[PDB]
Design an enzyme around this catalytic site. Structure first.
Site, PDB file in Angstrom:
ATOM      1  N   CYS A 192      -6.734  32.372 -54.866  1.00 15.27           N
ATOM      2  CA  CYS A 192      -8.103  31.837 -55.274  1.00 15.27           C
ATOM      3  C   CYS A 192      -8.241  32.175 -56.850  1.00 15.27           C
ATOM      4  O   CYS A 192      -7.912  33.211 -57.256  1.00 15.27           O
ATOM      5  CB  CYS A 192      -9.151  32.297 -54.494  1.00 15.27           C
ATOM      6  SG  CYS A 192      -9.056  31.791 -53.039  1.00 15.27           S
TER       7      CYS A 192
ATOM      8  N   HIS B 119     -17.307  33.834 -54.340  1.00 15.58           N
ATOM      9  CA  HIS B 119     -17.150  34.599 -52.944  1.00 15.58           C
ATOM     10  C   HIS B 119     -16.357  35.785 -53.232  1.00 15.58           C
ATOM     11  O   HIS B 119     -16.091  36.461 -52.270  1.00 15.58           O
ATOM     12  CB  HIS B 119     -16.454  33.507 -52.046  1.00 15.58           C
ATOM     13  CG  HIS B 119     -15.063  33.070 -52.189  1.00 15.58           C
ATOM     14  ND1 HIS B 119     -14.852  31.940 -52.488  1.00 15.58           N
ATOM     15  CD2 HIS B 119     -13.870  33.674 -51.995  1.00 15.58           C
ATOM     16  CE1 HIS B 119     -13.405  31.662 -52.563  1.00 15.58           C
ATOM     17  NE2 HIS B 119     -12.777  32.961 -52.258  1.00 15.58           N
TER      18      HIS B 119
ATOM     19  N   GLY C  49      -4.637  35.005 -51.894  1.00 15.88           N
ATOM     20  CA  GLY C  49      -4.764  35.807 -53.240  1.00 15.88           C
ATOM     21  C   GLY C  49      -4.640  34.797 -54.379  1.00 15.88           C
ATOM     22  O   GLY C  49      -4.726  35.198 -55.439  1.00 15.88           O
TER      23      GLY C  49
END
Ligand SMILES: *[C@](O)(C(=O)NC1CC1)[C@H](CCC)NC(=O)[C@@H]1[C@H]2CCC[C@H]2CN1C(=O)[C@@H](NC(=O)[C@@H](NC(=O)c1cnccn1)C1CCCCC1)C(C)(C)C
Ligand SMILES: *[C@](O)(C(=O)NC1CC1)[C@H](CCC)NC(=O)[C@@H]1[C@H]2CCC[C@H]2CN1C(=O)[C@@H](NC(=O)[C@@H](NC(=O)c1cnccn1)C1CCCCC1)C(C)(C)C
EC number: 3.4.19.12
Lengths: 305, 305
Positions: free
Chosen positions: A145, A41, A143
């Site tokens: 991920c 994503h 932040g």
């Protein structure tokens, strides 16, 4: 002696963290050999998240839409592909700091260490269990991920988790390193319930053995139980059923302490039905379920890596 | 969101661990530049431990009595000296993997990360607080002496702890990196009581702020208190006095949540005098006191290193 929530040394993983940017989204990637892995994503706009067609969205991206940085070094992306919910960016440089590794998919109730990162830089390290409902109770800010979870086996880092998202209950969900989510979740911004969380019974039993090994023995009793009768009590308190395979994995701890597994089950039965009466075990007032039998053995026997 | 007992990334320390042998005693050393630091009781026989004269015992040792190994590399000791209770072995090689560092002495109630090692190899990493009685509740087996505790500050590892011994209560004691013990202890095998342990009040308040930041707010109330009246209640429950300096260090958390420090003190007062009535805060049934205000800020704001 003593017993702590202990993570693996994180050195072999810190050398693999990089920063991946696509559009206005910056998150973390895992740089192994000449592939950088990150959540797919990264390619989405916030408007895309409600119902993304990742296949269509990735087709519109080119290699130069992906800015990968290893510290100050600018990595050149020469290829991109999607594997389930993870993006694989081929780069023009093999990472020298690449350890021996494999990708593994852990099972519910197993534990791992999380190296929390932001902008490709490690922030801290902590230990997590995969909950029976396939969430983790992590510590992740915006932040984070692309941060990964892992175990070390002798010399070989087994990567088992990449962080993707947070549920409205404050718990976290993500994939293995082949991109398959743990649990029922999909990477789309919709309501997606996690199941009932249950208590990881084999882990509670492991931690009770750890307490005995450390001289905390007040909960031991003369009672015994069959496995079936234990599970009848345990399931009433939303504990996972204890299987014969679980009994087997507790064998080493049973052998080292001299307390049969079903004898310790009879201890757990009484703690469930009577509470702890304001006492504590290993400093806890609640029963702890995020240590596996192997965790207890490694920590109480001093295995190194 | 989420809140975990989080340690610093341990990579910059893993590269400093070596194995030191003298006689039949093998433990860990810290290899910075061209000095290896280790506990001075590496030079003792088990019979020497009841009442050692370390000055006399070290005089009888020579450089070649110290076998230092960095993995397989055999380091040549070219000098030995004693600084308080730590031994400093000069070697013929500067450690390349030497990070930017300083030696610091932490104060009671401050936290640090422990890299537990055996035979010079890292076993795991966990977070500890220096207790008000200058012990730590660690996780250490035989062979762990010389393991170090540390914080990371931007790029600079501040070493604050080297492990020396375990008390009969299962808690641990050691020195700073200049060799001075924390607390009243001496490296001799005699009965040496640690003081009364008390609860680190400023840390409990920090963790209550962390709970509010994570949406756990049931303990907030309309009551307020003076600092003095708070300490009168807190000292009855064996809590450390809260100082005006403590109030100051909680300022950032007070500002971010909008809850005045003395307002949160009034929450803690009621929890102490009424218990939690079978409720939990951040998953705990007991109040947690091993997170500093800075720990909470770093974890809830995502500071990296
Ligand atoms: C991560 O990508 C990152 O670190 N990005 C860097 C800053 C630029 C980011 C970190 C979260 C704090 N993760 C996400 O943005 C993911 C992605 C992937 C899945 C959807 C989007 C949004 N997202 C989230 O983690 C969100 N969580 C949710 O949207 C939950 N949604 C709902 O509960 C819900 C309820 N009612 C209606 C609609 N949605 C998740 C979504 C997936 C299934 C479980 C529930 C936020 C709100 C950002 C935490
Ligand atoms: C460490 O040196 C190591 O890892 N060595 C490698 C394996 C070869 C080792 C690790 C402990 C598990 N530490 C020690 O051996 C220290 C040294 C330095 C101080 C004395 C000796 C023994 N020692 C200990 O940690 C012991 N602890 C004690 O002796 C306590 N003694 C008593 O409580 C006591 C009670 N009544 C009479 C006499 N002593 C300590 C000693 C120092 C002050 C606090 C209390 C053991 C039993 C090994 C944990």
């Amino acid at each position: 002696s003593g017993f702590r929530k202990m993570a693996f040394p994180s050195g072999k993983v810190e050398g693999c963290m990089v920063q991946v940017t696509c559009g206005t989204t910056t998150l973390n990637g895992l740089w192994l050999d000449d592939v950088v892995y990150c959540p797919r994503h990264v390619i989405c706009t916030s408007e895309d998240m409600l119902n993304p067609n990742y296949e269509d969205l990735l087709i519109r991206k080119s290699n130069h839409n992906f800015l990968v940085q290893a510290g100050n070094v600018q990595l050149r992306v020469i290829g991109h592909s999607m594997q389930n919910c993870v993006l694989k960016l081929k780069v023009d440089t093999a990472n020298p700091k690449t350890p021996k590794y494999k990708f593994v998919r852990i099972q519910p109730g197993q534990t791992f260490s999380v190296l929390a990162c932001y902008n490709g830089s490690p922030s801290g390290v902590y230990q997590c269990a995969m909950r029976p409902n396939f969430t983790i109770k992590g510590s992740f800010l915006n932040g984070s991920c692309g941060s990964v979870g892992f175990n070390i086996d002798y010399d070989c880092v087994s990567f088992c988790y990449m962080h993707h998202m947070e549920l409205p209950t404050g718990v976290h969900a993500g994939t293995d390193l082949e991109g398959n989510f743990y649990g029922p979740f999909v990477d789309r911004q919709t309501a997606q319930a996690a199941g009932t969380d249950t208590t990881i019974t084999v882990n509670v039993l492991a931690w009770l053995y750890a307490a005995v090994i450390n001289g905390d023995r007040w909960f031991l009793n003369r009672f015994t139980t069959t496995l079936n009768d234990f599970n009848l009590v345990a399931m009433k308190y939303n504990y996972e059923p204890l299987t014969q395979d679980h009994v087997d994995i507790l064998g080493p701890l049973s052998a080292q302490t001299g307390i049969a597994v079903l004898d310790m089950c009879a201890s757990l039965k009484e703690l469930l039905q009577n509470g702890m009466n304001g006492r504590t075990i290993l400093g806890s007032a609640l029963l702890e379920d995020e240590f596996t039998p192997f965790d207890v053995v490694r920590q109480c026997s001093g295995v190194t890596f």
